[PDB]
Amino acid sequence: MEFAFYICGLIAILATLRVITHTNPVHALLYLIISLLAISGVFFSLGAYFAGALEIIVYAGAIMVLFVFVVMMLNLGGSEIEQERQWLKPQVWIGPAILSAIMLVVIVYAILGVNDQGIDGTPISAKAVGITLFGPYVLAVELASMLLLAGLVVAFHVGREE
Amino acid sequence: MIPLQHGLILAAILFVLGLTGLVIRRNLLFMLIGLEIMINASALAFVVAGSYWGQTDGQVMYILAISLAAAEASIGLALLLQLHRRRQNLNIDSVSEMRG
Amino acid sequence: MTITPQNLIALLPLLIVGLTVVVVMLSIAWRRNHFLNATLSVIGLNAALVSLWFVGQAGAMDVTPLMRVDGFAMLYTGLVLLASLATCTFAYPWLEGYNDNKDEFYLLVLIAALGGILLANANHLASLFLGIELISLPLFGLVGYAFRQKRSLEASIKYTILSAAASSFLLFGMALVYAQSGDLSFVALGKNLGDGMLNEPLLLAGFGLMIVGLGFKLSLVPFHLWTPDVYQGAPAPVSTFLATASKIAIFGVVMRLFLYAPVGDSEAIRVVLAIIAFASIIFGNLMALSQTNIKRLLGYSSISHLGYLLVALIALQTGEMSMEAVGVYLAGYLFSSLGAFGVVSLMSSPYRGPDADSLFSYRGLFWHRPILAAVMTVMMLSLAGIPMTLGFIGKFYVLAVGVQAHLWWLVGAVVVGSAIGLYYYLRVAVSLYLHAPPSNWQYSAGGIVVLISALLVLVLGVWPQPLISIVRLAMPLM
Amino acid sequence: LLKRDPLNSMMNIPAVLSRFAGKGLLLSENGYLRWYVASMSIGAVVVLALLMVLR
Amino acid sequence: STEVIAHHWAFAIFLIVAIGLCCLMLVGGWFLGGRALRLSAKFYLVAMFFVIFDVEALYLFAWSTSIRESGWVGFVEAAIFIFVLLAGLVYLVRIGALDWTP
Ligand SMILES: CCCCCCCCCCCCCCCCCC(=O)OC[C@H](COP(=O)(O)OCCN)OC(=O)CCCCCCCCCCCCCCCCC
Numbered sequence: 001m002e003f004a005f006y007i008c009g010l011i012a013i014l015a016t017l018r019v020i021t022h023t024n025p026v027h028a029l030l031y032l033i034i035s036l037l038a039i040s041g042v043f044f045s046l047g048a049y050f051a052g053a054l055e056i057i058v059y060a061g062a063i064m065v066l067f068v069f070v071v072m073m074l075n076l077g078g079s080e081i082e083q084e085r086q087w088l089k090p091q092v093w094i095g096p097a098i099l100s101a102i103m104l105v106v107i108v109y110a111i112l113g114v115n116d117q118g119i120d121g122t123p124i125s126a127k128a129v130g131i132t133l134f135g136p137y138v139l140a141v142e143l144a145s146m147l148l149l150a151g152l153v154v155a156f157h158v159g160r161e162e
Numbered sequence: 163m164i165p166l167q168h169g170l171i172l173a174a175i176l177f178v179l180g181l182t183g184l185v186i187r188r189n190l191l192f193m194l195i196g197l198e199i200m201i202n203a204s205a206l207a208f209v210v211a212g213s214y215w216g217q218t219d220g221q222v223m224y225i226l227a228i229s230l231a232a233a234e235a236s237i238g239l240a241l242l243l244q245l246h247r248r249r250q251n252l253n254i255d256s257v258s259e260m261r262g
Numbered sequence: 263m264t265i266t267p268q269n270l271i272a273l274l275p276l277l278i279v280g281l282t283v284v285v286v287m288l289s290i291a292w293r294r295n296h297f298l299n300a301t302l303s304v305i306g307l308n309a310a311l312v313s314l315w316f317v318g319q320a321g322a323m324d325v326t327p328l329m330r331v332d333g334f335a336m337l338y339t340g341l342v343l344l345a346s347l348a349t350c351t352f353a354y355p356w357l358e359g360y361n362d363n364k365d366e367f368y369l370l371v372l373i374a375a376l377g378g379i380l381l382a383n384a385n386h387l388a389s390l391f392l393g394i395e396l397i398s399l400p401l402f403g404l405v406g407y408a409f410r411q412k413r414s415l416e417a418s419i420k421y422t423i424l425s426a427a428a429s430s431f432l433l434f435g436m437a438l439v440y441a442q443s444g445d446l447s448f449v450a451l452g453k454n455l456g457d458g459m460l461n462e463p464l465l466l467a468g469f470g471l472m473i474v475g476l477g478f479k480l481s482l483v484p485f486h487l488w489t490p491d492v493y494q495g496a497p498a499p500v501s502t503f504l505a506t507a508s509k510i511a512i513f514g515v516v517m518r519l520f521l522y523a524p525v526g527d528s529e530a531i532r533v534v535l536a537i538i539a540f541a542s543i544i545f546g547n548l549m550a551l552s553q554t555n556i557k558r559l560l561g562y563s564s565i566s567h568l569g570y571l572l573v574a575l576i577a578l579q580t581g582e583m584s585m586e587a588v589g590v591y592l593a594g595y596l597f598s599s600l601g602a603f604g605v606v607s608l609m610s611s612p613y614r615g616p617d618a619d620s621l622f623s624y625r626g627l628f629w630h631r632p633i634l635a636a637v638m639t640v641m642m643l644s645l646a647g648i649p650m651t652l653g654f655i656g657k658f659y660v661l662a663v664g665v666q667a668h669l670w671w672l673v674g675a676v677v678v679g680s681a682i683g684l685y686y687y688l689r690v691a692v693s694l695y696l697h698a699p700p701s702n703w704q705y706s707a708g709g710i711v712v713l714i715s716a717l718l719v720l721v722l723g724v725w726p727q728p729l730i731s732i733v734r735l736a737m738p739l740m
Numbered sequence: 741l742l743k744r745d746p747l748n749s750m751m752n753i754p755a756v757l758s759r760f761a762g763k764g765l766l767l768s769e770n771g772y773l774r775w776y777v778a779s780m781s782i783g784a785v786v787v788l789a790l791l792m793v794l795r
Numbered sequence: 796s797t798e799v800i801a802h803h804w805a806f807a808i809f810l811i812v813a814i815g816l817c818c819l820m821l822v823g824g825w826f827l828g829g830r831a832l833r834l835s836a837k838f839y840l841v842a843m844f845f846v847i848f849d850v851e852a853l854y855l856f857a858w859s860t861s862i863r864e865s866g867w868v869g870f871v872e873a874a875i876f877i878f879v880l881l882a883g884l885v886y887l888v889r890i891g892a893l894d895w896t897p
C-alpha cells in the first residue's frame with residue numbers, strides 16, 4: 001500500500017523532472033503521460049479510486065491526447081528550439097530553480113508543522129462521490145457544466161481555420 | 163498508515179517542478195505543459211487532503227479541478243494554434259508588442 | 263442540505279442568467295442574429311436584476327452547503343449585473359464593425375455574469391474557486407475576441423497563462439487549507455484551533471497561496487504586471503467588464519471569506535495584506551505618471567483603487583463600517599470605471615479592422631464630442647477623490663476606516679497616492695479641452711449609459727445619503 | 741542668492757522623487773510573460789516568507 | 796482477508812506477465828532472423844469537443860452509479876445537466892463546427 005505510493009510518487013517526480021528538461025515535445029508528453037499514470041497509482045493507493053480512474057480516463061486519456069494532437073498537427077521539428085539549448089544554460093535556469101527550491105523548503109516547513117495521524121487508506125468508492133456530487137454540490141455540477149460550455153465556445157471561436 | 167505530510171510534500175514537489183518548467187521554458191507549449199503539471203499537483207494535494215479526512219470533498223474538488231484543467235488546456239492550445247498560424251513561431255518572448 | 267422552493271426562489275438570478283445562456287445559444291443555433299441575441303442577453307440580465315427584488319422578498323438564508331444569500335449577495339449581484347448590462351450596451355456598437363461572428367460575445371458576457379453572481383453568493387471554497395474560473399474563462403474569450411489583432415491576441419495569451427498559474431496557486435492554497443481544517447466551509451476555516459494557536463503554519467501558507475491567486479485577480483502588487491497590457495490589448499467593452507465586474511465579484515467574495523473565516527483575525531495575514539495594499543497604492547499611482555495611453559493609465563488606476571479597497575479591507579475585524587465602506591467605494595468605482603471605459607469604447611466603436619490601430623487621441627475631444635468629453639472629465643475627477651463625486655465619498659469612507667483602526671501608514675499611502683492620481687487624472691481631464699488637428703440608437707444608448715453614470719456620480723457626490731442607506735440596508739449574516 | 745526661490749525647489753524635490761520612482765518602476769512592465777510568471781513566483785515566495793516569519 | 800491479497804497477487808501477475816510477454820515477443824522478433832502537408836484545425840476541434848464532452852461524461856459517470864440514492868432531485872439536476880449538454884451539442888452542430896466537408 002505505502003510501497004506503491006512511494007514508488008509511484010518517485011516515478012511521477014522523475015517523469016515530471018524529465019518533462020521540464022526535455023526538448024522533444026512528443027517525448028515530453030510521453031513522460032507526462034507516465035507521470036499521470038504514476039499519480040493515478042498514488043490515487044489508487046490512497047483509496048481515492050474515482051480520482052485515479054478519472055486521471056487515466058480524462059487527464060491521461062483526453063487532455064494529453066489533445067496535447068499530442070496539437071504537437072503532431074504543428075509538426076514540431078524543433079526549429080529554433082532544438083538548436084538553441086537555452087534552458088540548459090545555467091545562467092537561465094539557476095535563478096528560477098533556486099527560487100522554486102526556496103518556495104519548496106518554505107512549503108515543506110509549513111507542511112511539517114501540522115497534525116498528522118496518517119491516512120488509513122480506506123477506499124472511498126465512486127458511489128459516495130456521486131452521492132455528494134448530486135447532493136450537497138448540485139450548483140457545483142451545473143456551473144461546472146457552464147464552465148465547460150464556456151471553454152468549448154471560446155476554443156471554437158479561437159481555433160477556427162477560415 | 164501513509165502520512166498526509168508525505169503526500170503533501172509530493173504535491174508541493176510536483177507543483178514547484180511544474181512552475182519551474184513554466185518559467186524556464188520559452189516555448190508556449192512547454193509553458194502549457196508546466197501549467198498542466200501545476201494544476202495536476204494541486205488536484206493531487208486536494209485528493210490527499212480529502213483522503214486524510216475520509217471525505218468525498220477532496221474527490222469532488224478534484225473533479226472540478228480536472229474540469230478546469232481540461233478547459234484551460236483547450237483554451238491554451240487554441241491560443242497556441244492561433245499564435246502558430248498568424249506568426250509561424252511559438253516564441254513567447256517575441257510576443258511583447260505592448261509594454262510600459 | 264437539499265433545495266427547497268424557498269431555496270429555488272432565492273436562486274432566481276443564477277437560474278435566470280443560466281436560462282438566458284441556454285436561450286441565447288438556441289437562438290444562435292437557430293439563426294445568427296446580432297440584434298436578437300443581444301436583445302435576449304440584455305432582457306435576461308434585466309430579468310435577473312428585477313428578480314433580485316423577489317430574492318429580497320424571499321429573505322436571507324443559506325442555499326447550499328455552498329451558497330448563502332443575504333444583502334451582501336443582493337448588492338454585489340446588482341453591481342455585477344449592471345456592469346454586464348453596460349458591457350453589452352457598449353459592446354454592440356463595437357461589434358457592429360466586426361467581420362467575424364458577433365453572437366459569442368454576449369454568451370461569454372452572460373457566463374461571466376453568472377460567475378460573478380456565484381462569487382457574490384459564494385459561502386464555500388468550492389463555490390469561490392468555481393466562480394473565479396467562471397469569471398476567468400469568458401474573460402479569456404472576450405480579451406482575445408479580436409484574435410486577428412496582435413494586441414488582443416497577446417493580451418489573451420498573457421491573461422490565460424497568468425490566470426492558469428494563479429488558479430493553480432489558489433487551488434494548491436485551498437488544498438493546504440483543507441488539509442489543515444478538514445471542512446471547506448467559509449466559517450470553518452480555523453474553528454479547530456483555540457487558545458492562541460490560530461497561526462498554524464499550514465493554514466497560513468495555504469491562505470498565502472490563495473492571497474497570491476486573488477492578488478493576481480485583484481491586480482495587487484506584486485501580481486499586477488498583467489494589468490496594463492491586458493487592459494490595453496483587450497477590446498474596450500472587455501476592458502470595461504474586466505475593470506468593473508470581475509474586480510467587484512472577486513473583492514466581494516474576498517470580503518465574505520475574510521469576514522467569515524476565524525483565521526482572518528490573525529495578525530500575520532493582516533500585516534501581509536497591509537504591505538500588499540501599501541505597495542499596491544504606491545506602485546499603481548507612481549506607474550501612471552507618464553502614460554500616454556488611456557487603457558494602461560486606467561489599469562494602474564485599477565491597481566491603486568484596489569489598493570484603497572484592500573486598505574478598507576484590513577480594518578474589517580476592527581471597525582464596523584468597513585464592509586459598508588467597501589460597498590460604497592465599490593459602487594462609486596463601478597460608476598467611475600463604467601463612465602471612463604464607456605467613453606473609451608464609444609470612441610473606439612465601431613471596430614475598424616484588426617490591422618488598424620485603436621488609438622484614443624483624447625486631446626481636443628470637446629470640440630467634436632462635447633457631451634462625451636464632459637462625461638470623461640467628470641469620471642476623471644471622480645476617480646481622483648475630488649469632492650461632489652461618488653469616488654470622493656468612497657475615499658472618505660476609506661480614510662475614516664483607516665483612521666478608526668490606527669493604520670496610519672496606509673492612510674499616508676492613500677494621501678500620497680491621491681496626490682499622484684490628482685496629477686495624472688487632472689492631466690487627462692485638461693488634455694480633453696486642448697486643441698488637436700454612430701448614427702444609430704445603440705450608440706445613443708451607450709452615450710445615455712455614460713451620461714447617466716456621470717449624473718449618478720455627481721448627484722451621489724453632492725447627496726450621498728441614499729447610497730449610504732442602500733449599502734447599510736445590505737446587511738450580511740453575522 | 742534667493743531670486744531662484746530655493747524653498748520652492750526644496751518642496752518640489754518630492755515631485756522629482758516621484759517621477760524618478762515611477763520611471764524606475766515602469767521598467768518592470770517590459771511585456772515579457774516569462775518575467776510576469778517569475779514575478780508572480782517571487783511574490784508568492786515573499787508572501788509565504790513574510791507569513792512564516794510573522795507567525 | 797486471504798481472498799483480497801490473493802486477488803491482488805493475481806492481478807499483479809496478470810499485469811506483469813502480459814507486459815513481459817509482449818516485451819519477450821518483441822525481443823524475440825528483434826533477435827531472430829538475418830539482415831541484408833499542413834493539418835487543418837478540424838482535428839483540433841474534434842479533439843477539443845471530445846475533451847469537453849468527456850468531462851461532462853465523467854460527471855454523468857459519477858451520477859449514474861448513485862441514481863437510487865439521489866432520488867428524483869438528482870434526476871432533475873442531471874436533467875438540467877443533460878439539457879445543457881444537448882443544447883451545447885445542438886449549438887455545435889448547427890454552426891458547422893462538427894461538419895467536416897464545408
Ligand atoms: C520494482 C522496482 C521498479 C521496477 C520498474 C517499475 C515498475 C512499476 C512500478 C510502479 C507500479 C507498481 C508498484 C507496486 C505495486 C504492488 C502492489 C501493491 O503494493 O498493492 C498494494 C495495494 C493493494 O490494494 P489495498 O487494498 O490497498 O491493499 C492493502 C493490503 N492489505 O495497491 C493499491 O492500493 C494500488 C496499487 C498501485 C496502483 C495500481 C498500479 C499503478 C501502476 C502505475 C505505473 C506507472 C508507470 C510506471 C513506468 C515505469 C517505467 C518507466
Ligand SMILES: CCCCCCCCCCCCCCCCCCCC
Nearest residue numbers: 635636637639640643649650651695
Ligand atoms: C467638480 C465636479 C465636476 C463638475 C463639472 C466639471 C466640468 C464638466 C464639463 C462641463 C463642460 C465643460 C466645457 C468647457 C469649455 C471650455 C472652453 C474653452 C475655450 C477657450
